[PDB]
Design a protein around this ligand. Structure first.
Ligand SMILES: Nc1ncnc2c1ncn2[C@@H]1O[C@H](COP(=O)(O)OP(=O)(O)O)[C@@H](O)[C@H]1O
Ligand SMILES: Nc1ncnc2c1ncn2[C@@H]1O[C@H](COP(=O)(O)OP(=O)(O)O)[C@@H](O)[C@H]1O
Ligand SMILES: Nc1ncnc2c1ncn2[C@@H]1O[C@H](COP(=O)(O)OP(=O)(O)O)[C@@H](O)[C@H]1O
Ligand SMILES: [Mg+2]
Lengths: 99, 426, 101, 525, 47, 51, 51, 526, 78, 47
């Protein structure tokens, strides 16, 4: 979130299942782009350690572009659209290169 | 996201603002004419917060330099790395303020502040999500009180909901420059507790004894003065410019610094203070730097923290260290020295750290926090304001520009109400 | 000159009225001497407002002025015309003296 | 001196000493500023401490950007500030009257007379000069061909007469389509934009508005025809509550539910916009442009780009006043009463990039009542030449519309006014006979400077001009090409009535006050 | 900022002063000779 | 009106009938002298009425 | 500038260094609290008692 | 380095004749500065400020405030002119010349081995006889007459720079005091500083300056859809904000559900609409407050056809409350029908020199007005502002004390013959300092002929002979020509409160500076 | 702070006046009388005065002690 | 012994310079732009 960000635990069931619930939430988002046939996922910001765990599991390549003007030139290269939200089921805004 | 546009308004604001970007360009590795010289996402991710990336790789600082003097801001034109800003971020003023509050508002402010607001509008075009603005000025200056108070009121007509982090250079209780310094300090703060939320207090003349005794400087000047102030400015905007585990931006700093919005006067400072020769002959540990900020030897203002009580304590460390030792060391002071801390807060001292080392020093901590040390300094300003206004000395310098006798009466009633506002929990 | 030194039988307070809407001359006045700041009801350090329901937000915000104006209506309905305060009367509470005269 | 006894670090000037300070400083500002009066004046290159070139010859920009530290020069600069503030032109001629009202008075005060006797003659000469100015003004019912010659006179004296033919069509046609039916013309409705595209002689008059910011999304349309302007003042970007609240969640599945819910109030403002596009019969092109004064987050920019809505951000304060008149809509501050009545209309909305800086153009309006002069000067200093001449020309035609009469040109006013004070010189009947002579000779500097800058003789020109006025009834003037006396009302050289009225009032009071100063001193330390 | 008054007509001296008029020259010569009269007034007479 | 300031007066107070003295002088230097001279004059009549 | 003739207001604002001088300056401060007008005459008598 | 055994280190000691005759020369030095600024033939004095500004004036109060002196007796004379400026309007330059002349004749008696307490005891006996002389030569004034009050204010501005525009400045200063003369309870008061605001705008001519029947401020409308021209508006004055701000507490909201964050953002909009519904119950037209107005409050006032002004000053709100008769409320839910400013005239948002000005004029019976000054520059408009302040305070003294004294030298010569005839029954050592007070009053008719260049021997001998008879007694000095004209024919009349404050302050200045025989300088304080 | 003329009195000279001058002369003669006070009578001691050159002169005569003190006071030279 | 030439009519600059005429302003702007023409004359062309 954007305002503060705070996890609130009130019992032992919410503390032990919080770590396993975070890994299953990130696993369903990386596998959502592996079912669409993607191979290269290029991001603009940082990438957590759990995102690199399932990127190598489903065999998709990650590209880090820290520059935002270089990210706009890549959208005109492969013919894609930069998505401001996290990983959706991509309908038709994918890129298409050769190698 | 969370872009912050910087507004360096005043004569003292441009002297601090000249060395304010020297620390950011050195820590991030941003080349002034190249593209970047970073290493990882600790320095390259937060470039877009304080800089707007142009086409080709050149970075431009989100900085607006306002001054009612051509000769003062020419040092930031083509001097110590001053050719990196935008050409429209150099708004000059041909009419000097003359260290007068009424001249900078009604005479100079009626013709310039419509053009200064255009520079904030052009900077906000490259901001995808504007977090807030900062304002470095002074109370004993004409442009710092003229173009700092009128600029902070007209910016709320366009940004009524955004946060504000003002930096105020307080006048000194030791030496005086002119007799209108209690007039300029009372009028600028009277419109500052109205609709702002953050204001620091830095005394420049009080740092001359710190450089003489601790930093081992025989003949100090303005160049040696602003070096350790820039270390205090970089200590607050450390987690804002570098990612880490203790994520706390200016939005998280605006809430966890003040329980009440009116009593928003803080005491900045940092640690350690080493000279140019005795720095390498000193080891820096975790309880060494954490216990140095509470004493009176690490204050940026002419105040005494040994006779006061804090409300909220935040500290940002520099370097990969174990931050669990910071909370256990400070909790032992809250039980033996409970008259200096809050009785109902279990964690008074907050924790913040990054993985980027500073320039020169190996480890460094900064001290951000409010207390009753501003209460004893606000009494001396209202004491000088009472004796000058009762004789009505030099009131024709103010009332001739658009002020009145009732203007100083309302400026004296609410400023003495702020003295009783701090007198409750003292 | 020194021959115009007034001997005020009574007391000569060295202060102003403040708001310029109050009657500056009151005949047969009833002085209410009190020492507490007539400002908005600010909670102490030990009391904090932690709300769990968004519907209960505006009733707490109006309560800071309703408790404040509750004191100002019971000290003014007893015939008191002059109120002296060593604390502070903010701009919200000055309306109740202009309205009641 | 008495001031030296009380304060030893306080300079002073005595009675015969302070008069020589103010008069010799007025000759210093006169000899500098007389080289730019009229079309034959020379350009002045003004370099500041930074190194930027300010190439201009207006009398107000010359006095402000001049490295002078004098108390007499600061008094004339304040009178010259108000001349360029309320009526535009008349600043160079303002200083030359004060430079001659103190020099012609020095010939009598130094020859035994008292300075108060000369100031009594200035008031009696100002009364006749004010009555004579009302007899020479010509009412022409504010014709559109008359306003061309009024704007041509003010524009030639600031440019080399190749851009004066272009800027007159951009000033006269801009000032006519603002207000009608005897309404005061607001000069805030004309936007002045500085470009760099072609050349200095390419400044056109855009019938709508030119915004200096473009679209902030790469998927938006760059050229939009037949658009609907939706002027907003809401903040589409993410804002928090005023009370510091924050979030509290238990599981990671409830974390993503709060990010979706915190943008619900933001997306409710965007859903009011995309439903307005579907209610204006969107089975066509039907372009939509949202100017949107407050900032927009890239989440709402991505949502508006998929529907085909161009959305700008960070507009000016007066952009909600100029575009509201140009588009004909209503500048809304909320989305609770959205309707097609508050929408605007423009035939063409397109953008153009000039060195990574977009410029949004809005054109083809029915009755805009708000225009934009698009200055496209090549250099940075050439933009300051055209901008200082457009506002000198816009304030010239604004005074000619508000005032019902036009005043004649170069020498058709000042020579005829000086001859009227000679025949009324024995009408004072007292010691102030020489005060009217000092005021009549000070008004003759306007044909003297214009004959000097053009290269002609100074005394030989003033004899032939005063000969044609005394032997006829036509208000003859100065010709800067041949030197012969030519009538200014027939050749198309006009002037403003309020400029010549304030030149007889602001210069006369500031001359009678300077002549009555004898104790110039610096104390306060 | 602060302006100052320069020389006017005949300020051609290289460090010398000048006095003209009754108040600057005549009245100051009287008050200077008055101090010598009050000096030797005590030593005048047999007492 | 106390020469361009505001001063509030209470007349006879209906309970004890106290007294207050408002001094009037040429400048602020005389008013500081008139305050010290009046305070020393109040201490003289205090000791005579007591002792 | 302070124009006064009382023996207490003069000696309080005047700076002294000698230890025998601070006895006579603090002697004038005691006369205001005990009596209130007797504060030029005590200083001349106490100095002539030492002479 | 051993310290030197000293007492009262780094201070000075000075006593004897160097302090008694030293404070006289410091008083003579200030009186020679403003000596050429008393008569109608005076000249301006250009001053330079440490801020960079320029004060070009001939008023005796504005000159002495710009002079920083180091002499202690010279600092006393500056505070004398500050006292005369706050009590009366045109009682400045005359006291400094008179106190310098009363000390000029006091230096003569200090050389004659006379004690200074003998001269002060003769000054206090002479001061009590100057008050009784002015009350015998006074004349009652009909304050209801308009042409009689114009001759009093014209006599005070003939010295100043607005004597050329005397027909316009007299009508402005008379209508300014008569509008602000407000009386609510049983106490008459005239406040010409808090309610009679003198605003100056650079541009135009001085002949177009006039006192408005209402107030004016430099403020634009908050929204362009709001009306800039209302015929008869109902103005409601506010004091609090129309925004949503944080309370004076430690309020924090825990947001656990999804619908909680969108509800708080909707309750902030409903709170602004609640206070906007409470102000439209009285059907207003103009809403004026002192704090900011949010855009959510601008939307509800736009469709309700309400023109809102944003950031009017607190001193301007107190001035418009007297003109329109409104009540400055600080609670939108406590508005009443008496708090609405009915009776206000035409409201128009004009523009004077590329800047909007809010005009609230044409009121029925306003209790506060604003003088609109328009001139060449800000330099001469500060002169007219300082002259109208000296023109409105001399009208305040007549409305509180309708007695006139014949000025122009006739006031000083009528008392100088009264002190001379009363000195014949003295028969003591105080007789000769009593005669010097009557000779010290001669410096006011001395100044009126030294400024116009007339003779001081042939005129003062004839003027002293005119007051030998008890019948005429009102012959003064005409500063325009330079002859002796009776003041019953010229029309130069000064109020009683001006001449009484001039004599009471000039004597007591000589009382303070004659008792000073010692000066200690060099000590510090806290 | 009082004397600030354009032309000074003589050059820079200071001069006392009246009753503080006379007590200044009497008290100055008391200090120089202490150098001959202990040399009176058969039980009176002598004194030793050393100049800048190091020459020691021990004596008890008044004409010998007072000539070696180098007194520069005007009244004490009498 | 040696005299000097002071300011004449408008020398009011606090450390600034002033150029007027064909020789002091017009001909010096020509000779300054002539050195930039001779600077890049060598780097012009394929050789
Ligand atoms: N085409 C022309 N022919 C003759 N005289 C002209 C012409 N254009 C302008 N002038 C004269 O030049 C004078 C100054 O014009 P301008 O420079 O625009 O105003 P200012 O000198 O006040 O800045 C005017 O008084 C006018 O009479
Ligand atoms: N009318 C008078 N005749 C003779 N002596 C007087 C007269 N009035 C006052 N005095 C003397 O002047 C002295 C003033 O003393 P003062 O300085 O007031 O003492 P303190 O400093 O303790 O107040 C008194 O001791 C008194 O004897
Ligand atoms: N027409 C006149 N004839 C003679 N005397 C005049 C005339 N006009 C003004 N005066 C004199 O000039 C003096 C000006 O005094 P002024 O300096 O205004 O006093 P203040 O400083 O208190 O305002 C008045 O005392 C008045 O007697
Ligand atoms: Mg007067």
């Amino acid at each position: 979130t954007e305002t503060k960000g705070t996890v609130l635990i009130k019992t032992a069931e919410e503390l032990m299942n919080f770590s396993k619930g975070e890994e299953n939430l990130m696993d369903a988002q990386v596998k959502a782009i592996a079912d669409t046939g993607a191979n290269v996922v290029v991001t603009g910001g940082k990438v957590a350690d759990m995102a690199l765990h399932y990127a190598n599991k489903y065999n998709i390549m990650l590209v880090r572009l820290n520059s935002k003007w270089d990210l706009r030139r890549l959208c005109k290269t492969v013919g894609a659209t930069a998505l401001p939200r996290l990983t959706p089921p991509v309908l038709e805004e994918m890129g298409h290169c050769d190698s | 996201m969370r872009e912050i546009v910087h507004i360096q308004a005043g004569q003292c604001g441009n002297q601090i603002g000249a060395k304010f970007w020297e620390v950011i360009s050195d820590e991030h590795g941003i080349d002034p004419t190249g593209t970047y010289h970073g290493d990882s996402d600790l320095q390259l991710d937060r470039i877009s917060v304080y800089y707007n990336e142009a086409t080709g790789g050149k970075y431009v600082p989100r900085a607006i330099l306002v001054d009612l003097e051509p000769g003062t801001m020419d040092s930031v034109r083509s001097g110590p790395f001053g050719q990196i800003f935008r050409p429209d971020n150099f708004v000059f003023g041909q009419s000097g303020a003359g260290n007068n509050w009424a001249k900078g508002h009604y005479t100079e402010g009626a013709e310039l502040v419509d053009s200064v607001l255009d520079v904030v509008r052009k900077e906000a075009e490259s901001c995808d999500c504007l977090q807030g603005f900062q304002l470095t000025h002074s109370l004993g200056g004409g442009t710092g009180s003229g173009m700092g108070t009128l600029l902070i009121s007209k910016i709320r007509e366009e940004y009524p909901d955004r946060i504000m982090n003002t930096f105020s250079v307080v006048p000194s209780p030791k030496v005086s420059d002119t007799v209108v310094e209690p007039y300029n300090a009372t009028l600028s703060v009277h419109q500052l507790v109205e609709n702002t939320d953050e204001t620091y207090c830095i005394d420049n003349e009080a740092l001359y004894d710190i450089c003489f005794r601790t930093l081992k400087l025989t003949t100090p000047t303005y160049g040696d003065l602003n070096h350790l102030v820039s270390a205090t400015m970089s200590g607050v905007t450390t987690c804002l410019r570098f990612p880490g585990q203790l994520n706390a931006d200016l939005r998280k700093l605006a809430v966890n610094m003040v329980p009440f919005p009116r009593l928003h006067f803080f005491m900045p400072g940092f640690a350690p203070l080493t000279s140019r020769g005795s720095q390498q002959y000193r080891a820096l540990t975790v309880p060494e730097l954490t216990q140095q900020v509470f004493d009176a030897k690490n204050m940026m203002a002419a105040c005494d923290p040994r006779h006061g009580r804090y409300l909220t304590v935040a500290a940002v460390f520099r370097g990969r260290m174990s931050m669990k030792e910071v909370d256990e060391q400070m909790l032992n002071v809250q039980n033996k020295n409970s008259s200096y801390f809050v009785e109902w807060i279990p964690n008074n001292v907050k924790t913040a750290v990054c993985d980027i080392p500073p320039r020169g020093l190996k480890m460094a901590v900064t001290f951000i926090g409010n207390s009753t040390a501003i209460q004893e300094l606000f009494k001396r300003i209202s004491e000088q304001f009472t004796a000058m206004f009762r004789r009505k000395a030099f009131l024709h310098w103010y009332t001739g520009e658009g002020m009145d006798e009732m203007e100083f009466t309302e400026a004296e009633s609410n400023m003495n109400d702020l003295v009783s506002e701090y007198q409750q929990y003292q | 000159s020194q021959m115009e030194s007034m001997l005020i039988s009574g007391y000569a307070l060295n202060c102003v009225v403040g708001s310029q809407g109050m009657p500056k001359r009151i005949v047969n006045a009833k002085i209410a001497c009190l020492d507490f700041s007539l400002q908005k009801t600010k909670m102490k350090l030990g009391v904090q407002v932690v709300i769990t329901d968004p519907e209960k937000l505006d009733q707490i915000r109006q309560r800071e002025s309703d408790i404040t104006k509750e004191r100002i209506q019971k000290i003014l309905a007893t015939g008191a015309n002059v109120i002296l305060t060593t604390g502070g009367i903010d701009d919200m509470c000055l309306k109740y003296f202009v309205e009641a005269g | 001196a008495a001031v030296k006894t009380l304060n030893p670090k306080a300079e002073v000037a005595r009675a015969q000493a302070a008069l020589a300070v103010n008069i010799s400083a007025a000759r210093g500002l006169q000899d500098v500023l007389r080289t730019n009066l009229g079309p034959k004046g020379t350009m002045k290159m003004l370099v500041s401490g930074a190194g930027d070139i300010k190439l201009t010859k207006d009398g107000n920009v010359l006095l402000h950007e001049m490295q002078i530290q004098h108390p007499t020069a600061s008094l004339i600069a304040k009178v010259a500030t108000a001349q360029d503030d309320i009526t535009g032109d008349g600043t160079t001629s303002n200083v030359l009257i004060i430079g001659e009202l103190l020099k012609q008075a020095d010939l009598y005060i130094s020859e035994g007379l008292h300075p108060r006797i000369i100031t009594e003659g200035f008031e009696a000469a100002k009364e006749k000069a004010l009555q004579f100015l009302e007899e020479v003004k010509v009412s022409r019912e504010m014709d559109r061909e008359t306003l061309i010659d009024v704007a041509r006179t003010s524009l030639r004296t600031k440019v080399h007469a190749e851009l004066a033919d272009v800027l007159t069509e951009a000033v006269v046609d801009s000032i006519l389509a603002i207000k009608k039916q005897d309404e005061p013309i607001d000069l805030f409705m004309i936007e002045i934009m500085e470009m760099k595209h072609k050349s200095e002689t390419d400044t056109s008059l855009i019938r709508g508005l030119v915004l200096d910011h473009g679209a902030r999304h790469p998927d938006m349309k760059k050229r939009v025809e037949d658009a609907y302007i939706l002027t907003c003042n809401v903040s589409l970007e993410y804002e928090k509550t005023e009370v510091n609240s924050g979030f509290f969640y238990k599981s990671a599945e409830e974390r993503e539910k709060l990010v979706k819910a915190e943008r619900k109030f933001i997306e409710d403002r965007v859903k009011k916009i995309i439903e307005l596009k579907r209610k204006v019969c969107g089975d066509s092109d039907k372009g939509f442009v949202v100017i949107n004064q407050k900032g927009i987050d890239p989440f709402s920019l991505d949502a508006l780009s998929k529907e085909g809505i161009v959305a700008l951000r960070r507009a000016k304060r007066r952009n909600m006043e100029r575009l509201t008149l140009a588009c004909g809509g209503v500048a809304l501050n909320s989305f609770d009463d959205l309707s097609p009545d508050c929408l605007g209309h423009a035939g063409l909305v397109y953008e153009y990039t000039l060195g990574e800086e977009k410029f949004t153009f809005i054109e083809k309006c029915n009755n805009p009542r708000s225009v934009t002069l698009l200055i496209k000067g090549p250099n940075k200093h050439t933009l300051t030449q055209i901008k200082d001449a457009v506002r000198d020309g816009l304030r010239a035609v604004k005074n000619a519309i508000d005032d019902g009469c036009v005043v004649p040109g170069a020498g058709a006013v000042e020579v005829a006014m000086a001859e009227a004070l000679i025949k009324h010189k024995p009408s004072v009947k007292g010691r102030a006979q020489l005060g009217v002579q000092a005021f009549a000779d000070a008004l003759l500097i306007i044909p003297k400077v214009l004959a000097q800058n053009s290269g002609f003789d100074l005394q030989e020109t003033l004899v032939k001009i005063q000969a044609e006025h005394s032997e006829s009834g036509q208000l003859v003037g100065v010709d800067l090409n041949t030197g012969e006396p030519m009538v200014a009302a027939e050749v198309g050289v006009w002037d403003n009535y309020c400029v010549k009225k304030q030149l007889l009032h602001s210069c006369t009071v500031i001359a009678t006050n300077i002549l009555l100063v004898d104790e110039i001193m610096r104390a306060g330390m | 900022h602060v302006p100052k008054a320069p020389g006017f007509a005949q300020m051609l001296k290289e460090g010398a002063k000048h006095f003209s008029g009754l108040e600057e020259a005549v009245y100051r010569n009287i008050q200077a000779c008055k101090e010598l009269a009050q000096t030797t007034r005590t030593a005048y007479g047999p007492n | 009106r106390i020469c361009d300031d505001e001063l509030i007066l209470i007349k006879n107070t209906k309970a004890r009938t106290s007294a207050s003295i408002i001094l009037r002088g040429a400048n602020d230097f005389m008013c500081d002298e008139m305050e010290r001279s009046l305070h020393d004059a109040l201490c003289v009549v205090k000791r005579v009425l007591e002792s | 500038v302070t124009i006064t003739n009382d023996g207490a207001t003069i000696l309080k604002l005047l700076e002294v260094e000698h230890p025998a001088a601070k006895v006579l300056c603090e002697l004038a401060d005691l006369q205001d609290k005990e009596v209130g007008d007797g504060t030029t005459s005590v200083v001349i008598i106490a100095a002539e008692l030492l002479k | 380095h051993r310290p030197v055994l000293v007492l009262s280190q780094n201070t000075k000691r000075e006593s004897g004749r160097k302090v008694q005759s030293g404070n006289i020369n410091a008083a003579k030095t200030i009186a020679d500065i403003i000596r050429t600024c008393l008569g109608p033939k005076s000249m301006m004095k250009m001053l330079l400020d440490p801020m960079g500004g320029i004060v070009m004036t001939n008023d005796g109060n504005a000159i002495l405030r710009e002079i920083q002196v180091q002499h202690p007796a010279a600092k006393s004379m500056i505070e004398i002119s500050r006292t005369q400026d706050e009590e009366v309007g045109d009682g400045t330059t005359s006291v400094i010349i008179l106190a310098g002349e009363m000390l000029s004749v006091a230096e003569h008696f200090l050389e004659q081995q006379m004690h200074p307490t003998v001269v002060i005891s003769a000054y206090r006996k002479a001061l009590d006889d100057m008050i009784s002389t002015l009350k015998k030569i006074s004349i009652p004034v009909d304050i209801s007459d308009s042409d009689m009050m114009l001759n009093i204010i014209n006599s005070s501005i003939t010295t100043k720079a607005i004597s050329r525009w005397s027909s316009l400045a007299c009508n402005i200063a008379l209508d300014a005091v008569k509008m602000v003369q407000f009386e609510e309870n049983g106490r008459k008061e005239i406040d010409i500083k808090k309610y009679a605001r003198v605003e100056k705008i650079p541009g135009g001519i001085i002949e177009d300056s006039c006192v408005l029947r209402g107030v004016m401020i430099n403020k634009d409308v908050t929204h362009p859809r709001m009306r800039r021209y209302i015929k008869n508006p109902r103005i409601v004055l506010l004091d609090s904000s129309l925004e949503y701000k944080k309370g004076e507490s430690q309020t924090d909201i825990e947001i656990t559900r999804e619908e909680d964050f969108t509800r708080i953002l909707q309750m902030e909009e409903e709170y602004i609409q609640q206070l906007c519904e409470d102000i439209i119950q009285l059907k207003p037209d103009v809403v004026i407050t002192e704090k900011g107005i949010s855009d959510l409050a601008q939307h509800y006032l736009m469709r309700a056809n309400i023109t809102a002004i944003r950031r009017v000053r607190k001193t301007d709100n107190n001035r418009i409350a007297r003109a329109c008769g409104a009540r400055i409320v600080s609670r939108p839910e406590e508005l009443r029908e008496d708090d609405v400013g009915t009776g206000a005239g035409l409201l128009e948002i004009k523009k004077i020199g590329d800047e909007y000005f809010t005009f609230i004029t044409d009121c029925k019976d306003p209790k506060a007005c604003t003088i609109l000054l328009r001139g060449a520059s800000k330099e001469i408009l500060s002169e007219v502002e300082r002259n109208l302040q000296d023109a409105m305070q001399v009208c305040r003294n007549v409305l509180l004390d309708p007695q006139l004294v014949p000025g122009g030298g006739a006031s000083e010569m009528a008392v100088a013959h009264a002190l001379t005839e009363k000195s014949k029954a003295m028969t003591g050592v105080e007789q000769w300092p009593y005669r010097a007070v009557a000779q010290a009053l001669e410096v006011i008719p001395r100044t009126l002929i030294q400024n116009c260049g007339a003779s001081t021997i042939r005129l003062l001998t004839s003027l002293r002979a005119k007051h030998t008879q008890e019948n005429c007694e009102t012959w003064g000095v005409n500063g325009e020509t330079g002859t002796l004209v009776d003041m019953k024919e010229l029309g130069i009349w000064e109020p009683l409160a001006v001449k009484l404050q001039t004599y009471k302050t000039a004597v007591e200045t000589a009382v303070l500076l004659l008792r000073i025989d010692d000066i200690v300088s060099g000590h510090k304080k806290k | 702070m009082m004397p600030t003329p354009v032309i000074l009195l003589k050059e820079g000279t200071d001069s006392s006046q009246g009753i503080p001058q006379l007590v200044s002369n009497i008290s100055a003669c008391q200090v120089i009388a202490e150098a001959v006070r202990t040399t009176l009578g058969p039980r009176g001691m002598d004194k030793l005065i050393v100049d800048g050159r190091g020459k020691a002169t021990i004596s008890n005569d008044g004409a010998t002690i007072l000539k070696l003190l180098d007194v520069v006071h005007p009244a004490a030279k009498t």
